[PDB]
Amino acid sequence: GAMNSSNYAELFNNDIKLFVDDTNVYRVTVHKTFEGNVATKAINGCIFTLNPKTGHLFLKIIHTSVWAGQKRLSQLAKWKTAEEVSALVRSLPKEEQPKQIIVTRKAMLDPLEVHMLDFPNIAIRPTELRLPFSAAMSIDKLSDVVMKATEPQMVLFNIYDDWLDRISSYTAFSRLTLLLRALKTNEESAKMILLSDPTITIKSYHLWPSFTDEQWITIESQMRDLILTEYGRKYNV
């Protein structure tokens, strides 16, 4: 059924599963026309498909050419997402195909179910979790590859860098969701926290800085304080 706090450890068992988030597939800027009407201009987007156990991220870049001459783009974006996820599954060897796909938005259920009819044994599930994967485009290296793309493209990342050498996937996912929630709530402050110290760098082959174990404790506390501060600045508490 649906995925919630009661069955949270299921994410880190040995059944292959993928999260799919479609919140950055169809992206626009809204602007005025010469006549004073309003128009949209699409910008490149991406599908965020993540294995929460391994950190493998399948980042399918959605180039703006895919919208050319199409109508009802927000509806189309869900079906395009489902088409690309189905294509990814078919491209994987059988032993690498997921047993479950968890969509972060319920409107992806029917599009994905229909595109996956050939895979009756792959469960398509919603979640009650409010996950912060929309903030993926606040990660500089992910944003950069999406904006520079001149054609459809798939790029593979490990969103956990080398963290699983030292921590479990439960803890790695917890760190990821804290970082993304902070970036979503106050992007400027979160990035200041992650980079304020010039001596800690991001390896060429990583997304996040090379913090020691003790430094990650400090960073995680700072991210919590930020989320809490914003919760106060918001509701005035």
Next chain:
Amino acid sequence: MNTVPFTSAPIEVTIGIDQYSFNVKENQPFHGIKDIPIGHVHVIHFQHADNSSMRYGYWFDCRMGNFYIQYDPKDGLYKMMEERDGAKFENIVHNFKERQMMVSYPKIDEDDTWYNLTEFVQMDKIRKIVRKDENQFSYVDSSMTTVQENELSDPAHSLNYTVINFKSREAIRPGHEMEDFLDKSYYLNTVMLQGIFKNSSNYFGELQFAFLNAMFFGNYGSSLQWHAMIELICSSATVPKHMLDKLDEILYYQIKTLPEQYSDILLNERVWNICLYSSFQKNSLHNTEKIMENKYPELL
């Protein structure tokens, strides 16, 4: 004008004949229904006074044989049987007619209701949905499940309606996933009409039979089928004009005949609101929309 005689009425029972119903008391001298119009299928149905559980009945056509009803005290129900001795049957019915022991099919001369509800229903197609080849008439009851229900358990006792499933490979062409899910015209016109039913008359006949089984027996699987066959048409952007006009007439008379007090269990809110107000055909069912809005405005 044909006749379905009864041997007797040993248990108190409400007997229905098409959209009419009447009460017979225990051991009342009752020997059948006469003046049944030739040219239509009919249904004779039963609800026992002591156990309203299980409405049951028989679909039949008097052109196909001489049928009578006899109570079985072992199985505890009124059974339809065929009489093969035609002179015997005529002699029985005549005796009973002369003794005025038979009620009359009460058709008003102006009233086309039963024709309108059964226009496309044909006994030969009923016998393919209800499989019991040794009889010319077909038994249905409240509890019988459909083939589709049995996929999600006695096969011999199933209603073999055509399976409709909007999220199935049958309904969705590879490479046309969005197109076929949002516009079901392929599935309606190529898969179902051209492929399975062969023509719209057979499609409408199954739709009408599903409704009547829902209404007369409270058969849940039949109600599901009726609504699925409506939704498949309304969700298709491309439907022949004569089909839309006929569907409007079919549904109008179904909604007209439905008991006002059964609308809570026999009408699916989501299907009707989508069909009348969101679907491609939201503006094509004028007569149905008007009777629904005046008779069941709460559902909408």
